Amino acid sequence: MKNFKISSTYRAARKQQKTANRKSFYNDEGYMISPSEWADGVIKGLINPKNSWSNDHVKGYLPRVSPRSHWTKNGYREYLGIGKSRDIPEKEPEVIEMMDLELVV
RNA sequence: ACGGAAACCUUGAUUCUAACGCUACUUCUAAAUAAGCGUUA
Numbered sequence: 752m753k754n755f756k757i758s759s760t761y762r763a764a765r766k767q768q769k770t771a772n773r774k775s776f777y778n779d780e781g782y783m784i785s786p787s788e789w790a791d792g793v794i795k796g797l798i799n800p801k802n803s804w805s806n807d808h809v810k811g812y813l814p815r816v817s818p819r820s821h822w823t824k825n826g827y828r829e830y831l832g833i834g835k836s837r838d839i840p841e842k843e844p845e846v847i848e849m850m851d852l853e854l855v856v
Numbered sequence: 857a858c859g860g861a862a863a864c865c866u867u868g869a870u871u872c873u874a875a876c877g878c879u880a881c882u883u884c885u886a887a888a889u890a891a892g893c894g895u896u897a
Contacts, residue, residue, distance in 0.1 A: 775895085808894085
């Protein structure tokens with residue numbers, strides 16, 4: 752994930768909805784566990800501490816992610832993925848002949 | 857040195873002929889190999 756970054760609106764929403772203050776923890780099978788047993792499993796090695804917790808939920812359907820920018824050769828700004836998005840029109844499509852087909856109104 | 861001696865209750869005979877442990881009965885009834893994708897970036 753390099754073309755996009757975390758949006759500032761979502762970061763502000765998460766910050767002052769305090770969703771990181773209400774984390775949920777999981778064991779290696781992805782089942783909700785109390786923070787005490789999560790700590791005990793992480794210390795024992797039975798849980799990977801990295802991918803085993805969630806930052807609650809942010810409400811309001813905000814865009815989580817915004818395009819990231821970089822510097823072109825002349826010092827102008829540009830979106831990272833705008834210019835290397837595509838080069839060929841992928842050929843396609845295929846026009847299948849299906850004149851014998853009863854459509855439904 | 858006896859109402860005593862001698863004398864097979866014996867011979868020949870198939871407990872045999874005929875007869876289906878048989879008639880009827882669905883291993884049957886419902887059921888998508890399918891559901892969840894969070895949070896961080």
